[PDB]
Paper text:
Phosphorus starvation response 1 (CrPsr1) from Chlamydomonas and PHOSPHATE STARVATION RESPONSE 1 (AtPHR1) from Arabidopsis were founding members of plant-unique MYB-type coiled-coil (MYB-CC) transcription factors. PHR binds to a GNATATNC motif (P1BS), found highly enriched in the promoters of PSI genes and in other cis-regulatory motifs, activating gene expression. However, AtPHR1222 – 358 Olig1 and AtPHR1222 – 358 Olig2 bound a biotinylated P1BS immobilized on the GCI chip with ~20-fold reduced affinity when compared to the wild-type control. Together, our experiments suggest that PHR1 may exist as a tetramer or dimer in solution, and that disruption of its plant-unique CC domain interface reduces the capacity of the transcription factor to bind its DNA recognition site. Thus, SPX–InsP8 mediated regulation of PHR1 and PHL1 has to be considered one of several PP-InsP regulated processes affected in the vih1-2 vih2-4 mutant. Together, our in vivo experiments reveal that SPX receptors interact with the CC domain of AtPHR1 via the surface-exposed Lys325, His328, and Arg335, and that this interaction negatively regulates PHR activity and PSRs.
Two additional crystal structures of AtPHR1280–360 obtained in different crystal lattices all revealed highly similar tetrameric arrangements. Given the fact, that AtPHR1 MYB-CC forms dimers in solution, we cannot exclude the possibility that the CC tetramers represent crystal packing artifacts. However, we did observe identical CC tetramers in three independent crystal lattices and in solution. The observed oligomeric state differences between full-length OsPHR2, AtPHR1280–360 (CC), and AtPHR1222–358 (MYB-CC) prompted us to investigate the putative dimer- and tetramerization interfaces in our AtPHR1 structures with the program PISA45. We found the dimerization (~1400 Å2 buried surface area) and the tetramerization (~1900 Å2 buried surface area) interfaces to be mainly formed by hydrophobic interactions. Both interfaces are further stabilized by hydrogen bond interactions and several salt bridges. Importantly, all contributing amino-acids represent sequence fingerprints of the plant-unique MYB-CC transcription factor subfamily and are highly conserved among different plant species. We identified residues specifically contributing to the formation of a CC dimer (Olig1: AtPHR1L319, AtPHR1I333, AtPHR1L337, shown in cyan in Fig. 2 and Supplementary Fig. 4) or tetramer (Olig2: AtPHR1L317, AtPHR1L327, AtPHR1I341, shown in dark orange in Fig. 2 and Supplementary Fig. 4) in our different CC structures. We next sought to identify the binding site for SPX in the PHR CC domain. In our structures, a conserved set of basic residues maps to the surface of the four CC helices (shown in magenta in Fig. 3a and Supplementary Fig. 4c). Mutation of AtPHR1K325, AtPHR1H328, and AtPHR1R335, but not of AtPHR1K308, AtPHR1R318, and AtPHR1R340 to alanine, disrupted the interaction of AtPHR1 with AtSPX1 in yeast.
Numbering used by the authors:
A (entry chain BBB), C (entry chain BBB): 312 to 355
B (entry chain AAA), D (entry chain AAA): 312 to 354
Amino acid sequence: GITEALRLQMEVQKQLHEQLEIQRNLQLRIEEQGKYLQMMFEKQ
Amino acid sequence: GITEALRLQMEVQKQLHEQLEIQRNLQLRIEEQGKYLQMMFEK
Amino acid sequence: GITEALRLQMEVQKQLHEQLEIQRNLQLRIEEQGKYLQMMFEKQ
Amino acid sequence: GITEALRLQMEVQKQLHEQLEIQRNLQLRIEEQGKYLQMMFEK
């Protein structure tokens, strides 16, 4: 009973961590785009 | 100017798609845990 | 025991649904930016 | 052109911040469930 709930909890937490990693990468790409757009605005 | 903005937009959207895929996997693991907990409650 | 695990499962699932809603909104803002950038590229 | 691209970028980043906040809440609920399951296993 509890053994299997814990196995499934660990699978949830594994997937959570993959989501957190991909989210930081997305944040970085979005922030890079923002810096570039801002640069092009400033330089004209 | 615009060429590079589009390149960076495509990289954002690539990362977004990977986020959507990992989110469906997370949803599935959470839904599976919920179904199991509910099963054990009913039993 | 199991009663409390189910209460906490429902809180996880509540937060999951809020994450899914915010994610669709983020996708829409990103897709709108893409359409605008593409428009400005095409029109020159 | 660029003014509107920046306006839309700010709206993307606003939504991103709301996603980060909801993600920490989700992480907390998941971590709380894990700690409880572990506690009940140990007991």
